[PDB]
Amino acid sequence: RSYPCDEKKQNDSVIAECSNRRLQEVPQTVGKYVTELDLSDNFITHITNESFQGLQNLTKINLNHNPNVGLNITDGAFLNLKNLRELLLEDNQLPQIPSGLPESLTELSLIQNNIYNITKEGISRLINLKNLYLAWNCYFNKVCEKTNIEDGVFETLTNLELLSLSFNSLSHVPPKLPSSLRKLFLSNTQIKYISEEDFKGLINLTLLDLSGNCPRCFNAPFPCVPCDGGASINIDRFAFQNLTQLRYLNLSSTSLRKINAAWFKNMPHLKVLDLEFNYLVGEIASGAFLTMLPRLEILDLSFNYIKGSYPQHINISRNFSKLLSLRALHLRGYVFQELREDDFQPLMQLPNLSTINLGINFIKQIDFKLFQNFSNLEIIYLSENRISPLEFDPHSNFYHFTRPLIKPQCAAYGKALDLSLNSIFFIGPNQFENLPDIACLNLSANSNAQVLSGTEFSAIPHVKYLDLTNNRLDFDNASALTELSDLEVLDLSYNSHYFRIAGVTHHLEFIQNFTNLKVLNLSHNNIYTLTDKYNLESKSLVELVFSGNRLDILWNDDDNRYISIFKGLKNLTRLDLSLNRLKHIPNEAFLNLPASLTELHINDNMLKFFNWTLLQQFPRLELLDLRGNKLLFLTDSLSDFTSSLRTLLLSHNRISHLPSGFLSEVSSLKHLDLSSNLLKTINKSALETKTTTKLSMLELHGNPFECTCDIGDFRRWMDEHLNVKIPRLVDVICASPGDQRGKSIVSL
Amino acid sequence: RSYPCDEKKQNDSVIAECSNRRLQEVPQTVGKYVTELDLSDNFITHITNESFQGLQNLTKINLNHNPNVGLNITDGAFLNLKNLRELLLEDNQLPQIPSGLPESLTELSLIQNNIYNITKEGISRLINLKNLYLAWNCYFNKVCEKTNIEDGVFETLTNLELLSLSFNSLSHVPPKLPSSLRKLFLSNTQIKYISEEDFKGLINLTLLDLSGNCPRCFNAPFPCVPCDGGASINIDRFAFQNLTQLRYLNLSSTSLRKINAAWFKNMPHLKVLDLEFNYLVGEIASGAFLTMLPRLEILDLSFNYIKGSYPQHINISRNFSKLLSLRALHLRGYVFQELREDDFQPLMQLPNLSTINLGINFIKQIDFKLFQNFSNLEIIYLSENRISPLEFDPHSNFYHFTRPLIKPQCAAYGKALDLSLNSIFFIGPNQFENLPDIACLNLSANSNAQVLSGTEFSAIPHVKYLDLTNNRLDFDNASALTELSDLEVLDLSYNSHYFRIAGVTHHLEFIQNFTNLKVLNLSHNNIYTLTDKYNLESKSLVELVFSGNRLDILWNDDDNRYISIFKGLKNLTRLDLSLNRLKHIPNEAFLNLPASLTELHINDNMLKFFNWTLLQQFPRLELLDLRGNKLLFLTDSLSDFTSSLRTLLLSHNRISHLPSGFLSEVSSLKHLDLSSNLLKTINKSALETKTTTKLSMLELHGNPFECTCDIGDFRRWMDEHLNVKIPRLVDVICASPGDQRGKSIVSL
Ligand SMILES: *[C@@H]1O[C@H](CO)[C@@H](O[C@@H]2O[C@H](CO)[C@@H](O[C@@H]3O[C@H](CO)[C@@H](O)[C@H](O)[C@@H]3O)[C@H](O)[C@H]2NC(C)=O)[C@H](O)[C@H]1NC(C)=O
Ligand SMILES: *[C@@H]1O[C@H](CO)[C@@H](O[C@@H]2O[C@H](CO)[C@@H](O[C@@H]3O[C@H](CO)[C@@H](O)[C@H](O)[C@@H]3O)[C@H](O)[C@H]2NC(C)=O)[C@H](O)[C@H]1NC(C)=O
Ligand SMILES: *[C@@H]1O[C@H](CO)[C@@H](O[C@@H]2O[C@H](CO)[C@@H](O)[C@H](O)[C@H]2NC(C)=O)[C@H](O)[C@H]1NC(C)=O
Ligand SMILES: *[C@@H]1O[C@H](CO)[C@@H](O[C@@H]2O[C@H](CO)[C@@H](O)[C@H](O)[C@H]2NC(C)=O)[C@H](O)[C@H]1NC(C)=O
Ligand SMILES: O=c1ccn([C@@H]2O[C@H](CO)[C@@H](O)[C@H]2O)c(=O)[nH]1
Ligand SMILES: O=c1ccn([C@@H]2O[C@H](CO)[C@@H](O)[C@H]2O)c(=O)[nH]1
Ligand SMILES: *[C@@H]1O[C@H](CO)[C@@H](O)[C@H](O)[C@H]1NC(C)=O
Ligand SMILES: *[C@@H]1O[C@H](CO)[C@@H](O)[C@H](O)[C@H]1NC(C)=O
Ligand SMILES: *[C@@H]1O[C@H](CO)[C@@H](O)[C@H](O)[C@H]1NC(C)=O
Ligand SMILES: *[C@@H]1O[C@H](CO)[C@@H](O)[C@H](O)[C@H]1NC(C)=O
Ligand SMILES: *[C@@H]1O[C@H](CO)[C@@H](O)[C@H](O)[C@H]1NC(C)=O
Ligand SMILES: *[C@@H]1O[C@H](CO)[C@@H](O)[C@H](O)[C@H]1NC(C)=O
Ligand SMILES: *[C@@H]1O[C@H](CO)[C@@H](O)[C@H](O)[C@H]1NC(C)=O
Ligand SMILES: *[C@@H]1O[C@H](CO)[C@@H](O)[C@H](O)[C@H]1NC(C)=O
Ligand SMILES: *[C@@H]1O[C@H](CO)[C@@H](O)[C@H](O)[C@H]1NC(C)=O
Ligand SMILES: *[C@@H]1O[C@H](CO)[C@@H](O)[C@H](O)[C@H]1NC(C)=O
Ligand SMILES: *[C@@H]1O[C@H](CO)[C@@H](O)[C@H](O)[C@H]1NC(C)=O
Ligand SMILES: *[C@@H]1O[C@H](CO)[C@@H](O)[C@H](O)[C@H]1NC(C)=O
Ligand SMILES: *[C@@H]1O[C@H](CO)[C@@H](O)[C@H](O)[C@H]1NC(C)=O
Numbered sequence A, B: 001r002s003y004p005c006d007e008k009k010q011n012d013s014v015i016a017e018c019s020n021r022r023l024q025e026v027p028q029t030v031g032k033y034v035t036e037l038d039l040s041d042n043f044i045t046h047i048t049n050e051s052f053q054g055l056q057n058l059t060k061i062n063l064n065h066n067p068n069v070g071l072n073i074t075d076g077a078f079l080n081l082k083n084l085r086e087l088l089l090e091d092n093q094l095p096q097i098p099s100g101l102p103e104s105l106t107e108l109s110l111i112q113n114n115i116y117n118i119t120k121e122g123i124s125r126l127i128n129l130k131n132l133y134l135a136w137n138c139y140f141n142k143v144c145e146k147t148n149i150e151d152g153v154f155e156t157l158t159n160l161e162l163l164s165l166s167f168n169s170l171s172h173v174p175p176k177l178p179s180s181l182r183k184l185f186l187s188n189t190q191i192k193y194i195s196e197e198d199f200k201g202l203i204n205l206t207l208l209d210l211s212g213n214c215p216r217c218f219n220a221p222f223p224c225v226p227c228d229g230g231a232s233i234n235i236d237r238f239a240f241q242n243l244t245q246l247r248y249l250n251l252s253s254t255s256l257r258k259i260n261a262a263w264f265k266n267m268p269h270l271k272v273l274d275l276e277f278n279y280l281v282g283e284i285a286s287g288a289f290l291t292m293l294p295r296l297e298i299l300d301l302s303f304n305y306i307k308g309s310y311p312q313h314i315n316i317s318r319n320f321s322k323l324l325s326l327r328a329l330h331l332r333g334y335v336f337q338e339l340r341e342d343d344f345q346p347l348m349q350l351p352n353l354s355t356i357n358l359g360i361n362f363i364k365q366i367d368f369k370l371f372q373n374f375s376n377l378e379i380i381y382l383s384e385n386r387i388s389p390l391e392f393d394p395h396s397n398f399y400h401f402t403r404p405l406i407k408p409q410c411a412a413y414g415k416a417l418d419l420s421l422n423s424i425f426f427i428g429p430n431q432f433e434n435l436p437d438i439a440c441l442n443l444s445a446n447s448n449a450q451v452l453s454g455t456e457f458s459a460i461p462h463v464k465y466l467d468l469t470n471n472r473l474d475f476d477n478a479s480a481l482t483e484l485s486d487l488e489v490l491d492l493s494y495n496s497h498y499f500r501i502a503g504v505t506h507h508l509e510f511i512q513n514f515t516n517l518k519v520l521n522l523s524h525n526n527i528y529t530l531t532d533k534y535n536l537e538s539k540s541l542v543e544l545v546f547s548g549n550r551l552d553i554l555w556n557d558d559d560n561r562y563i564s565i566f567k568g569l570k571n572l573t574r575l576d577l578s579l580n581r582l583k584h585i586p587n588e589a590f591l592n593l594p595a596s597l598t599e600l601h602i603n604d605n606m607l608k609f610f611n612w613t614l615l616q617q618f619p620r621l622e623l624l625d626l627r628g629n630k631l632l633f634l635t636d637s638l639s640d641f642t643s644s645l646r647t648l649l650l651s652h653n654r655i656s657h658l659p660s661g662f663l664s665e666v667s668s669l670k671h672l673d674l675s676s677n678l679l680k681t682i683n684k685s686a687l688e689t690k691t692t693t694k695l696s697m698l699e700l701h702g703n704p705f706e707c708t709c710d711i712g713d714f715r716r717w718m719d720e721h722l723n724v725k726i727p728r729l730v731d732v733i734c735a736s737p738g739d740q741r742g743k744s745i746v747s748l
């Protein structure tokens, strides 16, 4: 669109995406209309006053991860960009803060460099700075120096709201912090003592992160240095006195054995309290601090286990009943054998508690009926226990994953129960009695070997999304699951166990019984043989995932029984036939795929040939995905066979000719993917649709191009249609002639 | 060696391997010294009198699978090959038996063609034939005709010993069979009735296969047509009267409900009796026929279950106690809930019974102590049941797999117990009491989540090979397995369950405790973090499989703890580091790999660079395997860094230059693999070792070669060293110049 950069005029403003394009310099061709410039992930080793001459409306520049193999920045290189507000210089191996940065700046990131010198000369004049990131310059077993913070360097930054200094060796909270601060990150900074003076004047603070100071190092997944004797962090009883607005407090991995309730005396708006990786089993049981937390919404007490201990029960203070605003409680990694109804009484009147997380506790037994007696649990998270039948992203949390506990597609339906990664290897007749009205149920990876027979889920009959992936279900009864009459989504992925055995029964008849089944995933089941009924049928099903089965055997030329296997899926729009070892598809089998299809995937098979003519029988087909096969040839008469195709994905095949004509009157085609094929060239005509083109994406990288003078018309075409995104254009590489043998088009 | 063919002068005789070389004709360059010629798997569409002009010492020709896309053979094409004994013409889409075949023939195979016409004109003069294969010409839902066998066609073949007509539509045993027959195959031939006359004169017969006539079709994994009403095959009571020498009788899938004991009256040397896929639950219980089988060594009664039945116990006739020669009993697929000691009393005095196979019965409970009371069980096969804590190869068996029940590497150690693919999800304290002295134990795929602690295998303390693959073991105790003091082979593959979780313990210390541990497989465990001890140690271990773990994280530049992870494996010769997502290996980590290594695999990683200089620290290194990485460059000074390397595998990398010099003084190098790289050319010098070369294999296929006149010296070199196998030479393909763009070298 603006080589070597794209642009988006989106919408008030103008972004030049010049990312990951192995540039060796800032390109001088950037349009002076651009406001934001992304130069990240290139090979840039120098920035000078020449670099942005040039581009006086620039308000943001992202130089992260250059050269991605440090970056050498001249004094005052940016100094004449009057409008520059945001400057990202992460992971550039910088040995110092660049000198002569512009006073315009409001955001500066210097995360993941080699800076151990924070000087007034560097930053004290940047008086418009709001956010300053200096995290991850010295940590673990990196070779590096303690951070030298010149006294009062930050004091003149009277607009500073965010300061991040985590993952650096500091030893003390810096003094003379501006009272504008709202968020102060000091994790893993080797700070053993927090004095009364350290945060005294910071009355605007809403976040304080002191995690990983005096860390808990047992079983640490990184190089970990504890305080002497694995001692607790030492926090003066008044250290938080003035922090009246505090909303987030992270004390994870500070080796706490005791929580000074007084810490929260003046902090009545605290909403999120993170106490993972301490030694708090005692405090969880007794727990004065728990009376001081009236507005607390999220409490994380995960991984406080005593090593080698495996108590029968979890011991929860009555004082949990004081957590009236609590929405989510995380108690992973306490480690205990049995959860009884009594043990959680202090939680049962908390009006807003919607999520309980007891993952990873090695729990053997649960009194399931206790959950009903909560006021309004929405998410009951029991994944990764022992229940049986009745390297680091600097912009992420370091102590826990932040992905939803339950997939949003499943939780959307209603109350959720996650029993994955346990040992519920069959479901007895009372397994789900006394539960709430579960809508979303996860029994993935229970090595369940049951003959489901239409009774097993009768006590939670309203499940709508059921995840049964990674079990070993035995399909010997045609009434399986049929008691779930409102079932919409059924994941049977990775249940190959019994499908792989010819000699036992495989009954999938049950599929047809559901009036509202929409999405079925039969992936990675190794299905090659069925009992009695060879046809799948449903008046409702939208999407069928059949990848990683054996259609190569089901559609074997000497066997006619499966030739209409999917035809009875009369509503189907989406079908995934990937990874079925197919070398060809019998024409009759293809013509019996449902005519309702809008999306068909046959990627990662071994197809030599595709019968294009048969697309005439699929007038609703919008996406066809044939990536990763062995195809040599495309039809020259595509518009004779489809008027509907919008996306055609043909990467990783053996296509050496692209017929002039291919284009013709195709019109619906938005997205054509020809990357990773055997293409020496591309003719003009092969694109120039004499109707209207919807062409907006055309992929070509990984073809052995030839950059003889003509050209082709291709380059001319490219400019004739600057609005056709062609990603990875730098990866479209002349393999010839030899004056180009590793060059990107174009350059003459 | 003899383009386009190899040759082996091995040893009295001379084999020309011209297989799978996409030939379009029989090459006229075959040396008249050749005795056996393999032309299988090519694109040959014609055979004429010209084809073997030429080659008068030919005794064997294999033309199977031509053209592999039928084959058109002229009358008498082979007629002048006086010494021709064996002719394989399988899978050639032949519409008839070729005419004018030579009388010299002793073996003729015509399996998998379109022959429905067996005529005197075709074969009656082939009076030297011993073995005649005509199987698989008409079967399943192939479009084909009933087989017309001209009356008395076989009668003149008075040397015929083997006749195979299986998988053809016959309806009746052919009459006028020669009394020379020893083996008669008639499986799946649509023969409903066996009369007294059918085998009357066949006194030399030792094998008769009548399987799949009136088949059991429930749950059939192929198109199956039963006799009317699913009726039994009808075998006249005297049909086997004269078959006194019979050794093998296959009656699998003949819908038998009743076994006429009289069938075996005159057949006292029967050794193998196959009765799979019938309806014999009644006969197994009552069983007169069982008294008639004194020399029987293998009995197969698998898959006789009654559909939908799930009896509590298996019912075995007392008459099994008459099977005095029995060595192996196969009772898969009976389907029953519990095996009690009583139920197998009739087996317990059989002196030679070494294998009991009860796979695939969905058994829930076993009285394990019953096995001890057998005389000398060697293999106790219980795989694929429900036990819980206390398309078709025409040359293979069609009704069961013929691979060993136990891997020979494990069974070699002694008595074997296979409990794989059950639900023994923990091992209680008495689980293995009252067993024989087990040496080989398979607990693979029991979803076992146990903390092994050094007591669990105490009642079978002599296990030497333990297969624990595909479980979810929790390594929380450093004494795991240590009670097995003689343990030699330990397979922990596919136990990623708990390794993937950072926050729980992973203790592999136990490895060091074993005095005789030789082979350890830790593949596909996703190992990225260990507890307390970061080093693996053993004075004995020979082989460590560490593929599919996360060495990319273990050897992260900011973490020093795993930099000597394998160093303490002081005896190690073989190490597999494949599939660990490695982009580079820190030099220190490489130099700390044990100096004892003779074989190192680092294939299927993402390496851009390899430090060749560090091979100086591995003076015993014989094999180095770097396939499937991103390497661009080879060292020009290999002999400076190793004098030991014998095999170097470098396929699927990005190597475009092969330094002249690479060769130099390398001498130990037998096998060089450069296939699937980016090589435009290969210089002469790059090979011509001025010391002695051990070069015997050099792979090059899948490189973009250039076939400009010079040449190189390469082609000259090739002939200068005709004894260097270069497999897939036809796949070494000129990508240039354009007069060659898809040609194989060489051709000018
Ligand atoms: C078995 O198949 C189902 C159906 O394909 C899989 O769930 C589906 O996963 C896709 C791929 O992630 C989800 O699509 C994504 O949704 C997000 C959020 O809306 C969107 O941002 C992405 O661009 C993408 O569209 C799809 O919603 C989801 N469907 C359902 C019903 O949950 C499932 O993951 C497969 N199971 C396994 C074990 O592979
Ligand atoms: C875990 O690793 C072990 C050790 O590599 C695997 O067993 C080993 O498998 C190899 C590959 O098949 C066996 O080598 C083969 O032996 C046969 C018969 O002697 C030979 O003909 C072949 O050319 C080849 O050498 C090797 O014997 C065997 N080792 C042992 C101790 O059994 C094992 O399969 C791996 N487990 C999984 C689940 O992948
Ligand atoms: C059911 O639980 C399983 C296991 O906890 C979930 O599987 C994980 O899904 C996440 C998010 O997609 C993946 O990144 C993980 O790799 C999966 N983990 C494993 C162990 O397979 C699954 O998503 C849960 N189902 C629902 C509906 O929430
Ligand atoms: C333990 O049992 C497992 C399962 O029966 C065996 O695994 C099979 O091994 C065969 C022969 O290598 C493979 O072709 C199969 O794919 C494997 N099956 C499965 C389900 O994984 C294993 O070989 C047995 N171990 C020993 C020592 O005999
Ligand atoms: O089955 C169990 C039970 C308890 N623990 C404990 O859980 C903690 C984390 O692994 C350790 O202290 C360990 O003793 C386990 O690891 N596995
Ligand atoms: O768990 C069980 C028990 C029995 N069967 C029976 O085994 C035979 C083969 O699948 C069928 O008759 C079926 O009823 C099973 O499939 N699963
Ligand atoms: C950059 O600075 C040099 C002097 O060091 C000057 O000669 C040159 O014109 C400057 N370039 C721009 C674009 O200002
Ligand atoms: C940085 O670059 C300048 C010129 O662009 C050069 O003179 C200087 O040596 C470089 N500094 C470092 C520390 O590499
Ligand atoms: C710190 O930076 C200052 C100010 O730019 C510089 O003068 C000094 O040399 C630096 N000191 C160290 C130790 O890097
Ligand atoms: C607190 O914050 C605001 C800006 O959000 C600032 O203007 C005000 O002066 C601050 N007060 C103190 C005491 O720092
Ligand atoms: C399925 O199981 C139910 C419950 O045991 C049983 O009653 C029914 O007969 C079974 N078979 C079929 C085909 O539905
Ligand atoms: C058919 O599929 C569509 C999506 O294409 C879905 O909206 C509708 O609910 C399904 N129809 C039926 C009858 O279930
Ligand atoms: C495509 O299939 C049609 C109908 O099955 C058939 O007539 C035609 O020959 C096939 N085309 C190719 C190119 O094989
Ligand atoms: C093959 O037969 C033809 C006659 O059909 C004859 O002219 C020719 O010489 C023969 N070739 C050989 C090698 O015998
Ligand atoms: C077989 O080949 C001969 C000549 O080589 C040709 O004349 C004849 O038509 C072919 N026969 C068939 C059935 O294709
Ligand atoms: C069978 O082969 C004979 C002898 O070669 C031939 O004459 C006849 O045409 C063939 N009959 C059929 C039905 O193919
Ligand atoms: C049986 O077999 C031998 C060859 O093995 C043959 O010579 C002998 O004549 C045969 N006897 C009969 C009765 O066919
Ligand atoms: C391992 O388990 C055994 C048996 O319970 C126990 O006695 C021992 O103390 C455990 N721990 C270690 C480190 O061996
Ligand atoms: C060391 O390895 C070899 C194979 O290299 C093996 O023969 C020997 O038993 C092992 N040594 C010890 C001490 O276990």
Ligand SMILES: *[C@@H]1O[C@H](CO)[C@@H](O)[C@H](O)[C@H]1NC(C)=O
Residues within 6 Å of the ligand: B587, B588, B611, B613, B614
């Ligand atoms: C190979 O490693 C050695 C020793 O660690 C080091 O001196 C040398 O620079 C490395 N070689 C390359 C080519 O990086």
